[PDB]
Amino acid sequence: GAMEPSAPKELKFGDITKDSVHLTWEPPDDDGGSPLTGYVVEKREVSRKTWTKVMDFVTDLEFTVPDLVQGKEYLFKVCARNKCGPGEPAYVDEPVNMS
Ligand SMILES: [Ca+2]
């Protein structure tokens, strides 16, 4: 419910490769009143409407997203979790392309 952390801050991507990107972020301002336990990473190709889980329960401020396809544009969103589930998502600023 409303025990939701705020969004992670400064979601950014770098270190692009043939098949991966490296996301980094900072902790949310509000943890929802319960300690943060991890982050959840989702992705979607820009032309599809569906978000897809990449990894949950990430205990870091970063994640290398694997198995990305050359020629596709991708979006990513990260949410912080606490014991009551994930909070509001942070979004990348622009899609990631591949080549
Ligand atoms: Ca680390």
Author numbering: 1 to 99
From the paper:
Titin is a giant, elastic, sarcomeric protein with a molecular weight of more than 3800 kD. Titin consists primarily of two types of protein domains: fibronectin type III (FnIII) domains and immunoglobulin (Ig) domains (ca 100 residues in length) that account for over 90% of its mass. This 30 kD segment, also termed MGT30, consists of a domain triplet of composition Ig-FnIII-FnIII located in the titin segment at the junction of the I- and A-bands (I/A) and corresponding to domains 4 to 6 in this region of the chain, i.e., tandem I109-I111 also termed I/A4-I/A6,.
To gain an insight into the possible molecular determinants of I110 recognition by anti-titin antibodies, we elucidated the 3D-structure of the isolated I110 domain, the double tandem I110-I111 and the full-length MIR region I109-I110 using X-ray crystallography. Domain I110 also presented such typical features without detectable deviations. In fact, its structural comparison to FnIII domains from titin with known 3D-structure revealed a remarkable agreement: namely, RMSDCα values for superimpositions onto domains A77, A78 and A170 yielded values of 0.81 Å, 1.02 Å and 1.18 Å, respectively. The I110 domain showed a stable and same structure when isolated and arrayed with its neighboring domains. In the present study, we clearly showed that the single antigenic region of the titin MIR is its middle FnIII domain, I110. In another two Western blots, four more anti-titin sera and two HC were also tested with the same result. These results suggested that the antibody epitope in I110 is formed by a linear sequence motif and is not the result of a three-dimensional, spatial arrangement of amino acid residues with specific conformation. In brief, structural analysis did not lead to the identification of unique features in I110 that might support its unique recognition by anti-titin antibodies. An analysis of sequence conservation relative to FnIII used as negative controls in this study reveals a subset of surface residues unique to I110, that could mediate its specific recognition by anti-titin antibodies. The available crystal structures will support future studies that could resolve the role of these candidate residues in I110′s antigenicity and permit mapping their formation of epitope(s).
